[PDB]
Design a protein around this ligand. Sequence first.
Ligand SMILES: [Mg+2]
Length: 219
Amino acid sequence: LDKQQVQLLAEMCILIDENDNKIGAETKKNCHLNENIEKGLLHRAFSVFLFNTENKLLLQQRSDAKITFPGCFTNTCCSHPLSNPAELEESDALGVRRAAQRRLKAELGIPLEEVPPEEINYLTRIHYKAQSDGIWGEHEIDYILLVRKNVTLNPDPNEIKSYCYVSKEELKELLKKAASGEIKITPWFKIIAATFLFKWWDNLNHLNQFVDHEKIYRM
Ligand SMILES: [Mg+2]
């Protein structure tokens, strides 16, 4: 496996129960092993959907170095808060927003100053489980975050092998090519595009009717 990505496997994730209450901490490696997921290990995560002024969504294609879903197209950023004081903060989901700011800089090279927590809109949470291969997989309650800004980019090639802003029609053609096997997409992107994505995209200026901090949608 890629050395840089192997080093990130030692990061401490936040373990949660099924209602997103923190119950412990565990390494990223252990949180993504199917053998631990099969026993119910679950951690907190987030997914960013970043739109620019032209109302295009910023997608990334994961690098081939990623241990789970390498080379797959997905939304702007999908990662997780760490088990440290700053990112465990539950007030107004500030820990998750701080982690999103941190990873947007680490993966896409977006300056910390362009995406401070006050620019990151927490919409709702989705619970899902998937397998990448026989060894690795995912099991998380994902905080869906939305950003609307014309950021600057300087991505880390270790993280992504490409990025692109897409209009709604372009995302639709992308999804068609994924159905043909032409390209691959991640499960969390597939789930969200099939459920809430186009709904939020049509109301970027009035996301209020779409905010739900109470329910955890079980996908
Ligand atoms: Mg995860």
